[PDB]
Amino acid sequence: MKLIWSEESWDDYLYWQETDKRIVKKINELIKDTRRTPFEGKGKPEPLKHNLSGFWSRRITEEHRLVYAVTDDSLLIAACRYH
């Protein structure tokens, strides 16, 4: 499954790499779990609505969420910072 980052989400990830390695590891753990079971597991995956319909969200922290979308063979990361 291809892992796709937008310019914005890669920026979010780089921010964590230079801000808090714990968050980087959590995001990696969530990506790994999502690859295994896209809509089940860690971070309590839940569907977003309207403008973000089709995207799902998992909790990184009580403030930051991993927002993503899954296709037949790709995991799209829309964001991993903010809510």
Method used to obtain the model: X-ray
Asked if 31 and 75 count as a contact pair (C-beta separation under 8 A), the reply is yes
Q: Which of 7, 18, 29, 83 is catalytic?
A: 83
**40 contact partners, CB below 8 Å, separation of at least 6:** none
DSSP state, residue 42:
T
Alpha carbon distance 8, 22 (integer Å): 20
18 included as an active-site residue: no
Pairing mode of beta strands 74-79, 2-5: parallel
**Resolution in angstrom units:** 1.8
Domains in the chain with CATH codes: 1-83 (3.30.2310.20)
Asked if 2 and 73 count as a contact pair (C-beta separation under 8 A), the reply is yes
50 included as an active-site residue: no
Q: Both ends of the chain: CA-CA distance in Å?
A: 25
Bridge partners of 58, per DSSP, are 66
* 18 C-beta neighbours (distance < 10 Å), count: 8
Alpha carbon distance 61, 83 (integer Å): 10
> In 9-73, at which residue ranges do the beta strands (DSSP E only) sit?
46-47, 56-59, 65-70
Alpha carbon distance 22, 39 (integer Å): 23
Q: Which of 7, 46, 63, 64 is catalytic?
A: 46
Q: What is the SS3 assignment for 77?
A: strand
